[PDB]
Amino acid sequence: DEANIETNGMVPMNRLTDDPRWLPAMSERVTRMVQRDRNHPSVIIWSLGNESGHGANHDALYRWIKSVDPSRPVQYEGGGADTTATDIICPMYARVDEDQPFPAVPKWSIKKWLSLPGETRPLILCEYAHAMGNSLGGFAKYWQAFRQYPRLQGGFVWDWVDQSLIKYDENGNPWSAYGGDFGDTPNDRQFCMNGLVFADRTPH
Amino acid sequence: RRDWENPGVTQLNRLAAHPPFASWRNSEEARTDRPSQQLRSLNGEWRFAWFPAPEAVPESWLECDLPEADTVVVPSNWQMHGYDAPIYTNVTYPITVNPPFVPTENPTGCYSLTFNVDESWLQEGQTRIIFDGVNSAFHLWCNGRWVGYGQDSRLPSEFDLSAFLRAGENRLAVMVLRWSDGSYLEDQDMWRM
Amino acid sequence: RRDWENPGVTQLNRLAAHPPFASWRNSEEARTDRPSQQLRSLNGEWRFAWFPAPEAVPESWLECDLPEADTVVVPSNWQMHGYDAPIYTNVTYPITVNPPFVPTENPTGCYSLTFNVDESWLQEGQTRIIFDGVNSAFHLWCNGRWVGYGQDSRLPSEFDLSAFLRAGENRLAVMVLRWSDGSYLEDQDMWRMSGIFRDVSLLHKPTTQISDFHVATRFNDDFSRAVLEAEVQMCGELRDYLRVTVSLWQGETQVASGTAPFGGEIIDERGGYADRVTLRLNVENPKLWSAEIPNLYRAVVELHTADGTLIEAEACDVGFREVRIENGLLLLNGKPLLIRGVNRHEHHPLHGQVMDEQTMVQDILLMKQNNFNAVRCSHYPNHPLWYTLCDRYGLYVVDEANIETNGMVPMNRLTDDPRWLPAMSERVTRMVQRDRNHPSVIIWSLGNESGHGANHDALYRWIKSVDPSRPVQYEGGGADTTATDIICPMYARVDEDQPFPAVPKWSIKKWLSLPGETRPLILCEYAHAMGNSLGGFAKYWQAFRQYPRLQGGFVWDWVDQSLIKYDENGNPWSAYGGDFGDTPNDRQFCMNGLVFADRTPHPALTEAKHQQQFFQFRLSGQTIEVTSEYLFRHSDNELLHWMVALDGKPLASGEVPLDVAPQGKQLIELPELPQPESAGQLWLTVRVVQPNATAWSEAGHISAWQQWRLAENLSVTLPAASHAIPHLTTSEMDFCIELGNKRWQFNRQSGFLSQMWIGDKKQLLTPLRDQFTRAPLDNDIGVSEATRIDPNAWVERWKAAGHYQAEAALLQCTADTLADAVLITTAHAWQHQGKTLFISRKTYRIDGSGQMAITVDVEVASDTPHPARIGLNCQLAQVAERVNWLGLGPQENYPDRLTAACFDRWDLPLSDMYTPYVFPSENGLRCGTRELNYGPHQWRGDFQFNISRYSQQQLMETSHRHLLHAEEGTWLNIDGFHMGIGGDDSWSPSVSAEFQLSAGRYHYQLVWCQK
Ligand SMILES: CC(C)S[C@@H]1O[C@H](CO)[C@H](O)[C@H](O)[C@H]1O
Ligand SMILES: CC(C)S[C@@H]1O[C@H](CO)[C@H](O)[C@H](O)[C@H]1O
Ligand SMILES: CC(C)S[C@@H]1O[C@H](CO)[C@H](O)[C@H](O)[C@H]1O
Ligand SMILES: [Mg+2]
Ligand SMILES: [Mg+2]
Ligand SMILES: [Mg+2]
Ligand SMILES: [Mg+2]
Ligand SMILES: [Mg+2]
Ligand code: NA
Ligand code: NA
Ligand code: NA
Ligand code: NA
Ligand code: NA
């Protein structure tokens, strides 16, 4: 269960999340979620949000949840996926064998990541195998590794269903629309369609 | 006040959050998870009008249905009714980055409903309304009087209407803003509705 | 909007918090800390009008002065001006607890100012106004237009007035609310006042400016190297030609400097802060900061163009020091601290809560002079100057968020509620943003007495994350929660556990070793100095010195919060809770200081000074071993003075220079100290003197002392058989004894020496009678009240047992004539309702020598509460100018508070034998006395005594010192024994067992003679 906090387009990413003036707004997005969902057995992990860098506000909220509901781990990927605000190393799109040593927020090979000096947590990718269009090449590579390494405990494919929308042609025939098709601009075109299934749930 | 341009204000008069309630007055019904006569749905046909900015909303709207409004299904996204365009942007914000401000042209959805409340509900106890999801921020009026405001498009906003309702017919007015300072924390890679 | 009843609104239009700025436009001025023309003060005379509620304020006020207003000085607390009463409540809130609402009758102070603004300030740049302290909430208008609102009475609120001012005359209007939702977080045990009680100023900044800067210092393993890192942020338009230069100076010398364009390193996938830059400067062998040697450098931050043109400069004092906890110990520059602390509120007897430089310096000097090295900001951020003074004079500081919800039920009701997270958060974060660059701040505190709630865990974590250089402490919720790096209990005792449920207060010794506990323990409050207190102080110091993880504590507290009131003749008197009509109130509980409100010390101050000494001594043979407790300095301004005296008579003395390394030892061999030619006890007294003046002390200041008994020669030379024989005259109702010009009279019906003469001069106003009680100390009373008795308080036990009402029943009175003397024998029983409490059996032997020897043997029923004292008392007829004694002194000293007192021959004015505690009680005792002289009388023995013009009866029946009146004659209390005064707390019995009078049978003897 994940708080409704994502500030991806900020520069740097944690501009608002590291700013104390934003703590209050952030805090209610985390606290009010817990207050609402803490009795559901299906929720096993809480998440502080997504793609909002790593700010001091995250550390504060991580600690608030740990204190109020010790029954569920807390995870958050921002800031490099292994910060102090996460109980699980939860990278997005880190590769099985190949390192991607981006400065400040490297995405190591998942097998190598577990064994970095001093590292001990489990690793579950918050996002992997980006199913955009004709994709999922290399999927088996992830499974083989998850089965072989105890601490590689799997992951969450990105994502379930294409975010296409229906529009109707001159013949009133409906068709699947993506970014830009509504005159919206700037737009991200087909990037809204990354699912394992089409919008109508037919499988890819 | 421009509360939608101040991250210091994310709600006004909103009740505390809690787990799902139904207020059953019968144990067996609670045990079996059956419908509760104390939890009513207001989903269905509402009246709706679109404005380009909050400043264009007429005051008459607070006490009287606008003749030009349409009857539409709620819940819904107004972009899905053709009122304005849904926007697909991934990382870059759909608005100029200049926290905590939003554009002056800020699409505003004016929703309203005339509905009935049983006398028994008002003779005793507390009657609240619950909006499970309003994107991205809104002010609420009941019978022309201001009730409160709320942010966070993905959690319920609840308000006590006990002092605002009358037995019989009542009218809700909800002014929904597309953009607000809460949009700064709502930059997920998905359609912006 | 009623913003003041909504925890969700803590301010409107307020600018971000940041460290002290001056916007200097000249680098040199920045470097030398001179005044800045760009920072102006608005303190002075303002217009003020009081209203009972915000709804009563006339709208005309926004636009024009109220003819009904008065002109008053600002800063000020309006209660100090008499507009309404200040309120003294300790725990209970002063308003109904019904968060987040406050009383409809909410005293409102309307302050206004007409002032000038020069066009040069408006034509370019930003003009902001800064209110350093406004209690408790306020709205601001400028030239009739609303600007913004703020809460948190203890941190500055700043607003941009750029667009509201005009060149020339301007008027500010400030509507100050006494109560607001912020008051639920301001429940500190102190006077409840309000107003603009901190400075008001206007600061001009360029539009392109330094908006924040943070300074950090890290070091190598042994501190011989450091790196200073300064992160600087700007506001305004970024330009490739801007630069920041940070340069570090040691006095007149620039030791390091760096310059760079803006653009910080990569932070994340989106890049870095284009609006910030971090300069890193290396410093070899830096001079380190500590309270022992507060070495400071000056860091100057210049915002300028590449070509060299300055835009603006900011600066701060920098102390190179590392604070860290390692292996369970709090280290400063790698050495374990021993905190000789005190909690200090911001209090002035005339000015309320307004603080001034003079008072603060006075407090600092007195603290240092008395061996404190640390201070806790109980319980809110202090006036900004405080930190500057601490940095420069050298004191360790605990900076504490303005958050205390003591009166809630349970205590964490608000702190565990996420809805109150926002408001608490700003009290913490704005404090850090303001003070993080002061080196005297070594520990941050989450606030006080607000239980332990999740909000505290969240804020603990925020600080840990933002400023790893300082530990975080917080006592709420049992003092050892997950929101504290230090076990920091208040009033935990040394050996005694107080296992309260949920939040026990363990013996500190025991606490450290609880299973799995590893943190250091520093009490945030201990040794409650209310009234005649500090009994048991040494007990804490002995433990601190023996246990590495016991690293000291903060005494509660520095200064009595009494306020001045005036009688009908304009004479001032000290008042406490209730004296302003305030009710409910907590009476004298506002007075718990080591010093009176005017800074005169209470007798406990010297006990503190002695126990907090930085040199320890041992005596072996002719050798004195001096050990240093300094961690960083050599004793370069100290010499040891030694003196040997026989029963007070100087016999030999000397001085030896002290040369001890920090934590070292020096052995000092004393000269052959020839035998005294006489009976008596030889005593050795040593003192450490600072021959040279310091920034905080006069040449000759005494820093430490200690005494030891050396050889003693008992008197074995019997009398001198002398001549006259006393004569006894018996009558039915008396026994009279005559010896030359002296007569003594024993009433046969009462059994007491009822009269005595020297010539025809009667010497007594009241018969000499036993006394088993004392005018109750505040520690004896605790929270007991007539309307609410606490049956466990000593005073209640005493009262209930009839100790104060007991009647002496004579059991025997006989007279015998001996060869050369007369012997009178008496026995009395004190009883109460049938029960016998005490039995007093005495003998009085009068010889040819004119001495009357009294022997007293008392029995105390095992089942009656242990009595406060076992002695005699009487009212003497004369009043003499001086009191001279051979015993412990010279200041007031009690059994459990006498370590600082030295045995010697003392002589003081009678007045100095009385301690004017504002709430009067037993006071002025001196213990271990072998000889006492007053007028023509002399008493010898081994006893404790007090002498003054007030009877114990009067002390106990008078609630304020200004109401006491000198009685006829002089009241002398002379005790064979006297109970300890306690003080571990002032709300539950605190006199340790070894100081209670529980032996059941006691013996004492006194010779009373005239000379
Ligand atoms: C395009 C990348 C630079 S960001 C990348 O975009 C994806 C598009 O589906 C997803 O939103 C991922 O979460 C995001 O990290
Ligand atoms: C009186 C106690 C129950 S509370 C006690 O009161 C003291 C009064 O000086 C101090 O304020 C302490 O901090 C507080 O714990
Ligand atoms: C003040 C510095 C010289 S300490 C210096 O820091 C280095 C990292 O920069 C290493 O930790 C060295 O071991 C340490 O001495
Ligand atoms: Mg808002
Ligand atoms: Mg994203
Ligand atoms: Mg408020
Ligand atoms: Mg308190
Ligand atoms: Mg000065
Ligand atoms: Na695995
Ligand atoms: Na595009
Ligand atoms: Na996508
Ligand atoms: Na110790
Ligand atoms: Na009272």
Ligand code: NA
């Ligand atoms: Na007090």
Ligand code: NA
């Ligand atoms: Na010396």
Ligand code: NA
């Ligand atoms: Na008294």
